[PDB]
Amino acid sequence: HHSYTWTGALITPCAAEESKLPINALSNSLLRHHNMVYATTSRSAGLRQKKVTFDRLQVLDDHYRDVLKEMKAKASTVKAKLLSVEEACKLTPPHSAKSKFGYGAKDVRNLSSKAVNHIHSVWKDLLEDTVTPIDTTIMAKNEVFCVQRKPARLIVFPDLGVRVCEKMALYDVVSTLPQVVMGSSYGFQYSPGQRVEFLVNTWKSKKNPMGFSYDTRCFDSTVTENDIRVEESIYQCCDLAPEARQAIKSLTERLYIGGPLTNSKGQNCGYRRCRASGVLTTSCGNTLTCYLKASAACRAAKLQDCTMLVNGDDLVVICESAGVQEDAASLRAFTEAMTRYSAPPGDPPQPEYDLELITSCSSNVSVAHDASGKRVYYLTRDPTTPLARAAWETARHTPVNSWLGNIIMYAPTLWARMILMTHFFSILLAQEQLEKALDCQIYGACYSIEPLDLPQIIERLHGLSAFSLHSYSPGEINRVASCLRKLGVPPLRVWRHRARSVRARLLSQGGRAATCGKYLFNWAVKTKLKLTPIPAASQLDLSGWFVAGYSGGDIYHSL
């Protein structure tokens, strides 16, 4: 029951890898302590392998099965449709990994005959063959972090032709089933403000609120063949075309359950018997499996009035405190139950009685004040990683622009507004690229977004309050200030000055550019403006922006 097996061949890169933070003429204006930023490479792949390789044990009891039966009952009310080849193709990221069969993402998106014919042939093979394991590629991810160094994460994905077939058979499923099965507990259905709203309204729902987060040690490796088959049983509960049932069955047996691992050089690196992190069902499956195990675990632990919030492998639980002593005991029972379900904790879960002290999805609730001085809750997080990546993206263009995604997701925060917005808008203006669409990711899906639309986008996801928040909490203030000292980032005084400069230059531009200056940097001037709803803000089609998670799902969308 080992998560993985290895032949000994090394996980190889498909291009030159940089470890040290690239430096340019802009670097210092943001960060001085360059040696604290690094990017993980294949060189550490070996360390990760040893961490994610272990034997799994599972003891499923009646609570587990009772929760599963309930989940299947909700799942049966779901009706999913097969996606056409064209539809699935249009969902393919312009820069997705090219197929090993003579065509790439560009060919897929343009519906080239070669790409369509191969896709159709792969689809046919899935319907006729439900046994032969599908090949996958294992790569060491290149991610940027701040020191104090972690080994590179691994990514396992099948060929482009297969990814397109996954979409056809399961896109509609993984996009709609989770919300029906888990209801208000499915986190990807909420925007940042909606997630904060759900957490506060839930916290208040309890007379004696108590909450905690649960971090499973390498969740993907804890997923057993049973878990993957259980997820399939849930999918099959949906009303599906017979052709889709066969495709989902086949993908489960040949890909999801496990298969061979091939490095970028074509050598067999080993075999996988756990969750593949680079497939379409990675997010939905982890969310379903985490919710199933945690729900059953809550019962075993006898937690009162439990309200859960699940996002992939990230879990949040808010319930009725039965006392400080009893809570601690319950939590331990919960952990023991989770462990029996093959989901041991990486870090011991601790009970919190202060919402702001609960961190889930690397984030936490905090409070500030809007123009009217009213108390307003918002989602924030430790700026360290976001700032380390912003430095890298300062001297190196990357496939994913983390700074953009961070600005969109945490626009109300002190650090995103003061630093991220000021810094990158200054750069955009200098290169006159304000209107250039850039790629960023929201909940694992890729989106092409033009900086000039940030104002309208932020107003839609956070409301005008994001443009005028102030008097942040002492806790948040200290955490940001510490980060800035650690990384060597200029003080507010400096950023405010740079913001006025950027703001003035934007206003001169006019059009949307001026809108960016007026709204994004109204906090910089001494005499703030009124700031009213943006007209074109209703034209934006953010329908599929916050519906589900697609981490590793190879999903694309054009705004």
Ligand SMILES: CCc1ccc(/C=C2\SC(N[C@@H](c3ccc(F)cc3)c3nnn[nH]3)=NC2=O)o1
């Ligand atoms: C990171 C270290 C730090 C210094 C001061 C604070 C706390 C601040 S600044 C602020 N408001 C200003 C602001 C500065 C930068 C921003 F990005 C937003 C708001 C502001 N001026 N005019 N309107 N609002 N409110 C607080 O509690 O944190």
